[PDB]
């Protein structure tokens, strides 16, 4: 190679060129995944969704009313500070970090008819630490996820080398899955309706849980996983079962709004709130 010097030549027109349409290659990837001609086609709306219908029919209006605040205004977040131009050395100086944080934080807008909180995704994390010695437990965990949820699990691979825990790097330690729409609706419905009621001593979810910008996380143990219908039906095929974390990601601007939304979906809360 004569040189390593990236440089994009400017154009003389405003027409946007996508070369995937000019290449005769990959004819079947030109169709959208929603197009019946695409091999990636998968029917989406096969049946009505009770949880979504309930949220659209009842909870949107109630949440709007509850979160209404008169003459509210946007609360801007911690952003990068700017150097005052009292010294020449400030001319090309990069901006300063936010006051309390090394990362910028989002602004909080008043709740209005267009931005009511709602569920956007659910992610299940299953990290079998005992899979460090046995790689097959990862496959078992993936099957547990597939049976509980119905979606394709994705493997989790070790990234750090910690000797005290005897954790190497590049090995399969478990599985994950992300849920949206009817599938997450079903997963949450079955959780609340079957599994959580069958836990020994269950008070709810901690009121001091969740990332500070919307999203609530809580865990389940192996005995708790045994309550799901699929496992109970064929106990024989489940000598061992694994726990997992559950992360519910919503549109809530702050965590307490998400807590109210989940309580609407019947998720109990026990601790004292921040």
């Amino acid at each position: 190679p004569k040189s390593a010097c990236s440089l994009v030549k400017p154009v003389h027109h405003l027409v946007k060129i996508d070369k995937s349409k000019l290449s005769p290659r990959f004819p079947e990837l030109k169709y959208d995944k929603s197009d019946i001609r695409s091999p990636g086609f998968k029917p989406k709306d096969t049946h009505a969704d009770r949880l979504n219908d309930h949220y659209l029919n009842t909870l949107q209006s109630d949440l709007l009313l509850i979160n209404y605040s008169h003459n509210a205004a946007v609360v801007k977040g911690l952003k990068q500070r700017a150097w005052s131009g009292d010294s020449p050395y400030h001319l090309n100086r990069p901006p300063k970090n936010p006051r309390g944080s090394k990362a910028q934080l989002p602004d909080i807008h008043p709740i209005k008819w267009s931005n009511i909180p709602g569920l956007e995704s659910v992610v299940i994390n299953c990290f079998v630490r005992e899979a460090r010695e046995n790689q097959l437990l990862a496959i078992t965990a993936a099957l547990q996820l597939q049976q509980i949820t119905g979606c394709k699990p994705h493997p989790i691979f070790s990234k750090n080398d910690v000797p005290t825990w005897k954790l190497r790097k590049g090995h399969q330690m478990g599985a994950k899955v992300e849920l949206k729409g009817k599938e997450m609706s079903q997963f949450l419905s079955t959780l609340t309706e079957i599994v959580l009621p069958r836990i020994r001593e269950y008070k709810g979810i901690s009121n001091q849980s969740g990332n500070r910008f919307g999203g609530i996380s809580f865990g389940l143990t192996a005995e708790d996983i045994k309550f799901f219908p699929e496992i109970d039906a064929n106990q024989d095929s489940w000598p061992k079962t694994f726990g997992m974390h559950i992360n519910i990601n919503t549109s809530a601007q702050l965590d307490y709004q998400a807590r109210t939304l989940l309580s609407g979906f019947q998720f109990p809360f026990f601790g004292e709130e921040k």
Partner: protein, 348 residues
């Protein structure tokens, strides 16, 4: 049921094949798809279950929406709004979609795809923008046809070119393609398809083919030559194939001279530009313009000055490429041109 009506709606908004019409609008799944010609394959085929009644209901829904759009269109006055509402009314028609998707869009048949109809015009615009326009712009930019000849281009018409008289074979030239001297010896024919609202009864077009690569030894550089030029040409949405049938000698400001590159003179680019003339109001009849033929250079051309002086706006373009071969001498002799020059192999 406005889509079943054809008192005022053009007849092209319907599938001209009775078999396919009946199958698409069938009541029970008793017929078979006309697309599958072989009976064997027809028996093998099995349509998705519960598809005709859902189709009937979706048809009814879309047809009610189209009826509302027609209601508002019959009352709108501005031609742009009228055309937009017509497009929105007929865009979702299964018959229109069938016709456009599965019939020719270049050599269109008036009774299937009529470009006098806003919906067909809009669907054609979308189809062109999907693939054809992007390729044209890529070829122009990469081969440096834009800055060399004209500052920019905002494509608004599809231009296709062909060389039917030279050899006898039929082929639309891909932009940027290399053509033999024999292929490009005789004359090109154009096809300028317009997709916007333009007054067919007043608008006139010009076409200039230029070569911005003819060497010039006075300053050790290149220069531009006007290969071909036509002015005062009128088109129609469905009859827009320019050929010696559709123009006179008064339209010709520079008769066609062929691509005749010189040996080791490099790969020459022949670029086609289509402009539309000014459209004066308060006057009846097309506004024809007279070209100053004693000022036209024809060998030291300046296209930017030409278009600026005659107030022309480009709407379409095309391009091909040429290089020396054995038939160049024969073409020179046939056209009465002097013997070609021969340049060195090295650029020093």
């Amino acid at each position: 049921h406005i889509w079943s009506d054809f008192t005022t709606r053009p007849s092209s908004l319907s599938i001209q094949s009775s078999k396919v019409k009946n199958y698409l609008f069938q009541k029970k799944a008793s017929l078979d798809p006309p697309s599958i010609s072989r009976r064997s394959n027809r028996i093998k085929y099995s349509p998705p279950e519960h598809i005709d009644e859902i189709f009937r209901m979706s048809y009814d829904f879309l047809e009610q929406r189209s009826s509302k759009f027609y209601e508002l269109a019959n009352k709108t006055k501005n031609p742009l709004k009228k055309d937009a509402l017509l497009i929105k009314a007929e865009i979702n028609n299964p018959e229109v979609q069938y016709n456009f998707q599965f019939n020719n869009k270049l050599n269109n048949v008036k009774d299937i795809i009529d470009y006098d109809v806003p919906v067909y015009r809009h669907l054609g615009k979308q189809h062109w923008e999907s693939y054809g326009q992007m390729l044209l712009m890529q070829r122009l930019e990469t081969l440096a046809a834009i800055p060399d000849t004209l500052p920019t281009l905002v494509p608004r018409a599809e231009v296709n070119i062909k060389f039917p008289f030279s050899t006898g074979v039929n082929k639309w030239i891909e932009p940027g393609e290399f053509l033999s001297s024999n292929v490009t010896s005789m004359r090109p024919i154009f096809k300028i398809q317009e997709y916007e609202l333009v007054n067919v009864e007043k608008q006139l077009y010009t076409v200039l083919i230029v070569n911005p690569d003819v060497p010039d030894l006075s300053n050790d550089s290149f220069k531009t030559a006007l290969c071909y030029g036509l002015v005062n040409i009128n088109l129609t949405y469905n009859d827009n194939l320019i050929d010696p049938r559709k123009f006179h000698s008064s339209n010709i400001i520079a008769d066609y001279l062929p691509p005749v590159p010189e040996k080791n003179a490099g790969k020459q680019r022949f670029v086609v530009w289509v402009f539309r003339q000014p459209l004066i109001e308060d006057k009846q009849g097309p506004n024809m313009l007279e070209i100053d033929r004693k000022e036209l250079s024809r060998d030291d051309f300046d296209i930017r000055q030409f278009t600026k002086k005659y107030n022309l706006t480009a709407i379409g373009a095309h391009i091909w490429r040429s290089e020396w071969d054995a038939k160049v001498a024969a073409v020179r002799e046939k056209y009465g041109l002097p013997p070609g020059r021969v340049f060195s192999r090295v650029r020093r």
